[PDB]
Amino acid sequence: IFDFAFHYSKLQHQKDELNDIPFMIVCEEAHNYIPRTGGIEFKAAKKSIERIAKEGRKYGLSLMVVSQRPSEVSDTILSQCNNFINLRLTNINDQNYIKNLLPDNSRSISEILPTLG
Amino acid sequence: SHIIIFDIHSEYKSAFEIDKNEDFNLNYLDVEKLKLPYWLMNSEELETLFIESNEQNSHNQVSQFKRAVVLNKEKYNPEFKKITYDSPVYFNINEVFNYIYNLNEEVINKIEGEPSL
Amino acid sequence: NLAQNEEVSFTLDGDKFFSKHVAVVGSTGSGKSCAVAKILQNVVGINDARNINKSDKKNSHIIIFDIHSEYKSAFEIDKNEDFNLNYLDVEKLKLPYWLMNSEELETLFIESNEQNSHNQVSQFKRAVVLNKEKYNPEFKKITYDSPVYFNINEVFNYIYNLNEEVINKIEGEPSLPKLSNGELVENRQIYFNEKLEFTSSNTSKATKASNGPFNGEFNRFLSRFETKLTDKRLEFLLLNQDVEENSKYRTEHFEDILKQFMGYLDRSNVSIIDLSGIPFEVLSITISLISRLIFDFAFHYSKLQHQKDELNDIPFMIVCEEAHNYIPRTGGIEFKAAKKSIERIAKEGRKYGLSLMVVSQRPSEVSDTILSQCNNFINLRLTNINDQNYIKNLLPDNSRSISEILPTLG
Amino acid sequence: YGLSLMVVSQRPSEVSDTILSQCNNFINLRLTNINDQNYIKNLLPDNSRSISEILPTLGAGECLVVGDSTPIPSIVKLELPNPEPRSQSIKFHKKWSESWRTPSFEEVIMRWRKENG
Amino acid sequence: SHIIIFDIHSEYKSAFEIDKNEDFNLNYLDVEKLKLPYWLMNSEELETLFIESNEQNS
Amino acid sequence: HNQVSQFKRAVVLNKEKYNPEFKKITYDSPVYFNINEVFNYIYNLNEEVINKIEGEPSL
């Protein structure tokens, strides 16, 4: 997908245009195959997805990391997200990790995280 | 709108499966329908799929398999000029298996550097 | 101007602002790119899309590391204004690999994750130094960090032949590598020329051929090496020496590379290096190489001109936007090359005539070794409590009382 | 045996602690870095509510003297030396707006090659 | 009065260079006027000048 | 490390020997393997002596 987007963007730049067919990749339970504490079991998958997080916005390619264990999700990938849709987080470690990453993590926003129904 | 969803716990299929009269179709790809040719993988994935194992390897296992793969790629793709181990070109895996099996049982010595005999 | 009074012009000590390290910080949507563009335009003399210094051009020198593509449109004005912008799309530029040091070469070609890395490092260093000596016979002090020409395909051939060598152990003649045809190899430097087929190893008394000390130890290293050598989006390294157009950039064409990044082709004040199309694997290495070249030029020029009872007459400023991408607080090994090179300008840059403008929207993620050396701060709106706390403890104590306006600024 | 050391450094945190810990007298000037301030405060023989708060507030030419040579630590304004040291610092803005300067690239690239350093 | 200054920036000669009528002389030793013979060094200094390099010692 | 490697190799070999029908037999496969035989294998490896007569195989 990344290579197709790259090549199509390269062709489109010759006509003074951009990628008119963008794509959104939605990952379900990302912590399974892009984990923070990972060795060799998930190395190609982490590298392939990471090349989209750090280089996919230029060639018309986005990501939607959906997970319930943010502390297990790799920090290199979650740190590239600009918008967050948060739900009720029960674990303290996940709450702290999400609080340390939100662009607007003021006290009013920080306190409203486990209260959500 | 273009969306690709990676699902590991199934689901998400009924959320987009509506009545056929709505002219909305879902490109649901599972193990039975997915077609991922093995020759599209690079060197790392090829070694992970075939060479990688719980037991330790030898000093002539990776070297011979790579040579056989390169030779098969060259034989089956004559129009291409630069053919390498990571080149995404078609190559028969059964031919590589036969090559390794035949190399595994040879009854000829060196007899110096004489190409004949 | 002043927010208190719109009719009061705000002025700064240029020699106390640009001669030191500036730290521009803010949040997404606060327009921190507009502030940097305005400051640089005021520096170079761009007012109302016009060049005030049209008659005589000044000595302003700014190099901007545009990881994204934003600042090119901020310095592109009408050609009648006689303003030249040194826009370097490095993805379509000639930046040879032989300008790198040990760290960048090791990061680009050697993976530390795999075990037995010491043997690979030693063999690569030996081969690189030997090739550098072979291709540059006039030079004497040739080291692993020397910016001199050397073929990379020959190094690959040397490593491949080492991985496949077979030594002869027949009595009488010396233990030398034996080829397939039976001819011995007197000099090991012939490994550079081409790949070789060695004799089979046998335990018989007639042949008694033993394996080489490094036989079979570079199977994974060679695969990664050939993957790197055959990457079509790394063509800006001139990494494919087989092409005649890429083998023509020798040590002689070194003075024309420094002029390229310093805006000295014909005449240029602002240089914009667009590091957008570069693969993110080698983003930090390119920054480290360019910064090291600039710093070494400044250091050598200052040392040369100190004996003439003068000082540097070409001070340079480096604008580093999105700093946390390549100089982060918690970095591994891929970011070691960039952090070390930048720290040498953040600690020893004032003497030789270099300045840093660290622009980042996440000041807490940038390494404290570089931010703590910044004297002047242009702080925009900050909404992260972990960011305000870090910048409050870095500001002068007199401004701590007024440092509570950061979330309120608009 | 009749030897004394005057360790002069603008980055105290980068100086070896095995040498800075043997100093009995300290002449502290304005320190801007927080790490240097903390290190000096820790090393100072006398820091009681009047030495730990004046270091960042020191002016130009004023130094705080803490040690055995004085009974009362105090801030002292030192007269300018005559003759003055040749402390040369490049002024970036002043050097700019002085027309276009073309350095001799051959000389600097020759000195770079360790030929005429 | 005996004072020895280790200056790496060459910024202290001016503070002690006054008119010759004052009969105050300064012992300014630069790389041109310095004479440190190599035979006065010990094993560590000798091996860090001739033998030590970035390669592997044979 | 040597003990772990030798024990794993012996266990895998014994599992393959005692369960010929199974193909994907690994170290973690719950299949029968005699432990006294593994002890004997390690003990014999502890006293291994290789014949090094010129011409004869190194066995």
PDB file of C-alpha atoms in Angstrom, chain E:
ATOM      1  CA  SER E   1      54.774  35.961  42.902  1.00  0.00           C
ATOM      2  CA  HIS E   2      54.577  32.784  40.802  1.00  0.00           C
ATOM      3  CA  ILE E   3      51.529  32.009  38.650  1.00  0.00           C
ATOM      4  CA  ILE E   4      51.216  29.544  35.755  1.00  0.00           C
ATOM      5  CA  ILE E   5      48.172  29.898  33.488  1.00  0.00           C
ATOM      6  CA  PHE E   6      46.904  27.201  31.112  1.00  0.00           C
ATOM      7  CA  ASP E   7      45.167  29.192  28.365  1.00  0.00           C
ATOM      8  CA  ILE E   8      43.505  27.367  25.462  1.00  0.00           C
ATOM      9  CA  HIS E   9      41.861  30.441  23.898  1.00  0.00           C
ATOM     10  CA  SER E  10      44.798  32.919  23.892  1.00  0.00           C
ATOM     11  CA  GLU E  11      42.940  35.636  25.793  1.00  0.00           C
ATOM     12  CA  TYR E  12      45.199  36.456  28.771  1.00  0.00           C
ATOM     13  CA  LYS E  13      48.362  37.896  27.192  1.00  0.00           C
ATOM     14  CA  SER E  14      46.773  41.358  26.980  1.00  0.00           C
ATOM     15  CA  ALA E  15      46.036  41.511  30.719  1.00  0.00           C
ATOM     16  CA  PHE E  16      49.759  41.167  31.532  1.00  0.00           C
ATOM     17  CA  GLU E  17      51.390  43.005  28.587  1.00  0.00           C
ATOM     18  CA  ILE E  18      52.231  46.527  29.770  1.00  0.00           C
ATOM     19  CA  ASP E  19      54.789  49.116  28.674  1.00  0.00           C
ATOM     20  CA  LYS E  20      58.447  48.113  28.873  1.00  0.00           C
ATOM     21  CA  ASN E  21      59.170  51.113  31.118  1.00  0.00           C
ATOM     22  CA  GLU E  22      57.411  49.294  33.982  1.00  0.00           C
ATOM     23  CA  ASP E  23      60.031  46.486  33.942  1.00  0.00           C
ATOM     24  CA  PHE E  24      57.328  43.798  34.122  1.00  0.00           C
ATOM     25  CA  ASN E  25      57.943  40.838  31.808  1.00  0.00           C
ATOM     26  CA  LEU E  26      55.579  37.974  30.987  1.00  0.00           C
ATOM     27  CA  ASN E  27      56.638  34.411  30.128  1.00  0.00           C
ATOM     28  CA  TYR E  28      54.314  33.760  27.186  1.00  0.00           C
ATOM     29  CA  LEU E  29      55.001  30.245  25.872  1.00  0.00           C
ATOM     30  CA  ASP E  30      53.189  29.409  22.635  1.00  0.00           C
ATOM     31  CA  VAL E  31      53.636  26.452  20.290  1.00  0.00           C
ATOM     32  CA  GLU E  32      56.509  28.272  18.567  1.00  0.00           C
ATOM     33  CA  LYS E  33      58.469  29.090  21.744  1.00  0.00           C
ATOM     34  CA  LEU E  34      57.650  25.899  23.680  1.00  0.00           C
ATOM     35  CA  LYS E  35      60.313  23.193  24.046  1.00  0.00           C
ATOM     36  CA  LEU E  36      59.025  19.913  25.502  1.00  0.00           C
ATOM     37  CA  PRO E  37      61.346  17.032  24.539  1.00  0.00           C
ATOM     38  CA  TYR E  38      59.693  13.693  23.851  1.00  0.00           C
ATOM     39  CA  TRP E  39      62.190  11.683  25.921  1.00  0.00           C
ATOM     40  CA  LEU E  40      60.799  13.206  29.143  1.00  0.00           C
ATOM     41  CA  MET E  41      57.554  11.224  28.767  1.00  0.00           C
ATOM     42  CA  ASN E  42      56.676   7.936  30.451  1.00  0.00           C
ATOM     43  CA  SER E  43      55.382   4.701  28.906  1.00  0.00           C
ATOM     44  CA  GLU E  44      51.752   5.829  28.707  1.00  0.00           C
ATOM     45  CA  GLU E  45      52.527   9.151  27.016  1.00  0.00           C
ATOM     46  CA  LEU E  46      55.024   7.584  24.600  1.00  0.00           C
ATOM     47  CA  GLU E  47      52.560   4.865  23.565  1.00  0.00           C
ATOM     48  CA  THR E  48      49.698   7.374  23.206  1.00  0.00           C
ATOM     49  CA  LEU E  49      51.788   9.435  20.750  1.00  0.00           C
ATOM     50  CA  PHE E  50      53.492   6.826  18.533  1.00  0.00           C
ATOM     51  CA  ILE E  51      51.711   3.484  18.968  1.00  0.00           C
ATOM     52  CA  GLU E  52      48.105   4.404  19.789  1.00  0.00           C
ATOM     53  CA  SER E  53      45.832   4.821  16.773  1.00  0.00           C
ATOM     54  CA  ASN E  54      42.280   4.048  15.654  1.00  0.00           C
ATOM     55  CA  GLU E  55      43.306   0.669  14.191  1.00  0.00           C
ATOM     56  CA  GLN E  56      44.116  -2.668  15.820  1.00  0.00           C
ATOM     57  CA  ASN E  57      47.675  -2.958  17.113  1.00  0.00           C
ATOM     58  CA  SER E  58      49.542  -5.767  15.376  1.00  0.00           C
TER      59      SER E  58
END
